[PDB]
Write an enzyme that holds these catalytic residues in place. Structure first.
Site, PDB file in Angstrom:
ATOM      1  N   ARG A  75      10.245   4.461  -4.691  1.00  0.00           N
ATOM      2  CA  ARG A  75       9.919   3.217  -5.439  1.00  0.00           C
ATOM      3  C   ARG A  75      10.478   3.591  -6.694  1.00  0.00           C
ATOM      4  O   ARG A  75       9.989   4.361  -7.675  1.00  0.00           O
ATOM      5  CB  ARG A  75       8.293   3.069  -5.444  1.00  0.00           C
ATOM      6  CG  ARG A  75       8.213   1.529  -6.397  1.00  0.00           C
ATOM      7  CD  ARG A  75       6.658   1.401  -6.400  1.00  0.00           C
ATOM      8  NE  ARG A  75       6.442   0.271  -7.489  1.00  0.00           N
ATOM      9  CZ  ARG A  75       5.426   0.374  -8.397  1.00  0.00           C
ATOM     10  NH1 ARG A  75       4.476   1.296  -8.312  1.00  0.00           N
ATOM     11  NH2 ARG A  75       5.336  -0.758  -9.309  1.00  0.00           N
ATOM     12  N   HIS A 119       9.186  -3.487 -14.557  1.00  0.00           N
ATOM     13  CA  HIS A 119       7.753  -2.477 -15.047  1.00  0.00           C
ATOM     14  C   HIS A 119       7.758  -2.157 -16.508  1.00  0.00           C
ATOM     15  O   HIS A 119       7.958  -1.011 -16.785  1.00  0.00           O
ATOM     16  CB  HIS A 119       8.150  -1.062 -14.020  1.00  0.00           C
ATOM     17  CG  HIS A 119       7.025  -0.254 -13.957  1.00  0.00           C
ATOM     18  ND1 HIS A 119       6.624   0.241 -12.709  1.00  0.00           N
ATOM     19  CD2 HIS A 119       6.256   0.377 -14.750  1.00  0.00           C
ATOM     20  CE1 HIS A 119       5.808   1.170 -12.745  1.00  0.00           C
ATOM     21  NE2 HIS A 119       5.398   1.188 -14.006  1.00  0.00           N
ATOM     22  N   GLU A 164       1.682  -4.320 -12.255  1.00  0.00           N
ATOM     23  CA  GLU A 164       0.522  -4.125 -12.842  1.00  0.00           C
ATOM     24  C   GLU A 164       0.229  -5.392 -14.161  1.00  0.00           C
ATOM     25  O   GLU A 164       0.403  -4.852 -15.140  1.00  0.00           O
ATOM     26  CB  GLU A 164      -0.080  -2.901 -13.696  1.00  0.00           C
ATOM     27  CG  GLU A 164       0.492  -1.804 -12.749  1.00  0.00           C
ATOM     28  CD  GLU A 164      -0.471  -0.445 -13.313  1.00  0.00           C
ATOM     29  OE1 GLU A 164      -0.618  -0.301 -14.662  1.00  0.00           O
ATOM     30  OE2 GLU A 164      -0.535   0.639 -12.759  1.00  0.00           O
ATOM     31  N   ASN A 286      -2.099  -0.178  -6.748  1.00  0.00           N
ATOM     32  CA  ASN A 286      -2.075   1.114  -7.453  1.00  0.00           C
ATOM     33  C   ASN A 286      -3.668   1.596  -7.651  1.00  0.00           C
ATOM     34  O   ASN A 286      -4.381   0.589  -7.772  1.00  0.00           O
ATOM     35  CB  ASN A 286      -1.577   1.019  -8.669  1.00  0.00           C
ATOM     36  CG  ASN A 286      -0.017   0.641  -8.709  1.00  0.00           C
ATOM     37  OD1 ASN A 286       0.730   0.706  -7.640  1.00  0.00           O
ATOM     38  ND2 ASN A 286       0.708   0.387  -9.970  1.00  0.00           N
ATOM     39  N   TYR A 288      -6.247   4.920  -9.134  1.00  0.00           N
ATOM     40  CA  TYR A 288      -6.236   6.045  -9.949  1.00  0.00           C
ATOM     41  C   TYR A 288      -7.628   6.676  -9.994  1.00  0.00           C
ATOM     42  O   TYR A 288      -7.864   8.014  -9.733  1.00  0.00           O
ATOM     43  CB  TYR A 288      -5.564   6.220 -11.183  1.00  0.00           C
ATOM     44  CG  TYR A 288      -4.005   6.121 -11.126  1.00  0.00           C
ATOM     45  CD1 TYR A 288      -3.442   4.875 -11.202  1.00  0.00           C
ATOM     46  CD2 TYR A 288      -3.338   7.229 -10.918  1.00  0.00           C
ATOM     47  CE1 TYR A 288      -2.089   4.736 -11.064  1.00  0.00           C
ATOM     48  CE2 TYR A 288      -2.009   7.030 -11.049  1.00  0.00           C
ATOM     49  CZ  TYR A 288      -1.371   5.774 -10.983  1.00  0.00           C
ATOM     50  OH  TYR A 288      -0.026   5.860 -11.027  1.00  0.00           O
ATOM     51  N   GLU A 341       1.157   3.226  -5.825  1.00  0.00           N
ATOM     52  CA  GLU A 341       0.707   4.185  -6.805  1.00  0.00           C
ATOM     53  C   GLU A 341      -0.381   4.992  -6.623  1.00  0.00           C
ATOM     54  O   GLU A 341      -1.320   4.450  -6.403  1.00  0.00           O
ATOM     55  CB  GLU A 341       0.779   3.903  -8.348  1.00  0.00           C
ATOM     56  CG  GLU A 341       2.311   3.414  -8.946  1.00  0.00           C
ATOM     57  CD  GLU A 341       2.088   3.238 -10.422  1.00  0.00           C
ATOM     58  OE1 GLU A 341       1.377   3.531 -10.982  1.00  0.00           O
ATOM     59  OE2 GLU A 341       3.099   2.186 -10.907  1.00  0.00           O
TER      60      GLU A 341
END
Length: 435
Positions: A75, A119, A164, A286, A288, A341
């Site tokens: 990616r 991005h 995002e 994504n 985290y 991600e």
């Protein structure tokens, strides 16, 4: 053991401004991240993407690393200003040449390109015209997307419009922490809305130009929990995929968002909703970190918890990735999901033995891959998983001080040193799961 489905896509992920350097090489226009990071006080230690990982020159070596590790998907993003230096109009053939070489090399080596169209490195020339605040960005984005499809859509068949968009709008235009560095709530929600309209226009163009491809969109998400036994409901709807997927799937913003932000949205925003519902092929998530949250008179505060944290100070909560996978199927049931991600920053050091013994990253990755496995066993159509990141890189307003790579980068030499986590992940991909 936890074996994944046959053909499951194991990937790594990067972004153009974070790794490339050479932002003005070969006729590229400036991006908003160039001008933002070159503005004193915006980025830690005055770091910029001038050099970064020098991937603009070392791209073949980096791809050979992906090949060597046997990773099946890459990616990466395309720098809009490399392709259209003023944002619209003129196309820069040398920009196209750079990505063409990367694409051809990946396919040569049996790596599947997943291309992020946007991005965060908006052409500065468009920012002068308002950027995401300007309704006309839906046309600009459409035109840019068309160029990419026409030039690369013959070989690239997996596309992502936006990375995002909550961060782009809110962190870029409300918090002012990211380019373009503005602090205006009405601008920020206009940006949310225009991001959707531009995403939808790009998907429309895609249907017309790449008849055999797949296109999706990527969202940041956090696992929010209540401090005591609604503020959690707000944070999920605002900070997670619903802010965008409720429009895309249902034709309106989520309820608690409208309660908070209706005054900040454009006056006839609903008139754009049918066009925004353009059909997508997959959702990228994504993930985290998790956050304990409580009401506080956005009327929400975070409560610090114990829990192991990364160098970002982000709380490590692996069950968040399962929760968000389950939740996304429950609420919108998209045909395909990818974790686009997942990863962690730690203070890596090269030992005297010349290795980076990042057991902490291995543990983080292992735990999350396990939870994603679980979601799969319970019906979530997860087709892939991408580690952020292949390389240590420019971590936005944190600069180079945060290393997310499974490959270590010595910035003084540009030497790459595969970390223990990279060797480990390589075994996971080869075995197609955990053991």
């Amino acid at each position: 053991v936890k074996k994944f489905p046959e053909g499951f896509l194991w990937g790594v992920a990067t972004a153009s401004y974070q790794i490339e350097g050479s932002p003005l090489a070969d006729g590229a226009g400036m991006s908003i991240w160039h001008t933002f990071s070159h503005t004193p006080g915006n980025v830690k230690n005055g770091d910029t993407g001038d050099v970064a990982c020098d991937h603009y020159n070392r791209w073949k070596e980096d791809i050979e690393i992906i090949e060597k590790l046997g990773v099946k998907a890459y990616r990466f993003s395309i720098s809009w200003p490399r392709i259209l230096p003023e944002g619209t109009g003129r196309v820069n053939q040398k920009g196209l040449d750079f990505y063409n070489r990367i694409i051809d090399t990946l396919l040569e080596k049996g790596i599947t390109p997943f291309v992020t169209i946007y991005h965060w490195d908006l052409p500065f020339a468009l920012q002068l015209k308002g950027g995401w605040a300007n309704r006309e960005i839906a046309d600009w984005f459409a035109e840019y997307s068309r160029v990419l499809f026409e030039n690369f859509g013959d070989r690239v068949k997996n596309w992502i419009t936006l990375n995002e968009p909550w961060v782009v709008a809110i962190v870029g235009h409300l918090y002012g922490v990211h380019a373009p560095g503005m602090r205006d709530i009405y601008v920020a929600f206009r940006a949310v809305h225009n991001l959707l309209r531009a995403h939808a226009r790009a998907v429309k163009v895609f249907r017309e130009t790449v008849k055999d491809g797949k296109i999706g969109i990527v969202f940041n998400n956090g696992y929010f929990e209540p401090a005591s036994e609604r503020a959690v409901r707000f944070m999920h709807q605002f900070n997670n995929y619903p802010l965008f997927l409720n429009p895309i799937y249902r034709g309106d913003y989520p309820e608690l968002v409208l309660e908070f932000a209706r005054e900040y949205l454009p006056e006839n925003y609903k008139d754009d909703m049918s066009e925004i519902q353009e059909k997508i092929d997959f959702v990228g998530l994504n993930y985290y970190s998790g956050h304990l949250v409580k009401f506080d008179p956005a009327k929400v505060s975070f409560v610090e918890r114990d829990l192991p944290k990364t160098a970002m100070g982000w709380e490590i909560v692996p069950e968040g990735i399962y929760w968000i996978l389950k939740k996304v199927k429950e609420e919108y049931n998209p045909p395909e999901v990818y974790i686009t991600e997942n990863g962690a920053a730690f203070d890596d050091v090269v030992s005297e033995d010349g290795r980076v013994h990042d057991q902490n990253r291995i543990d983080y990755l292992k735990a999350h891959i396990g939870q994603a496995w679980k979601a799969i066993q319970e019906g979530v159509p997860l087709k892939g998983y991408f580690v952020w990141s292949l390389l240590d890189n420019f971590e936005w307003a944190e600069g180079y001080s945060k290393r997310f790579g499974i490959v270590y980068v010595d910035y003084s030499t540009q030497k790459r040193i595969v970390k223990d986590s990279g060797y480990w992940y390589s075994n996971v991909v080869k075995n197609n799961g955990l053991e």
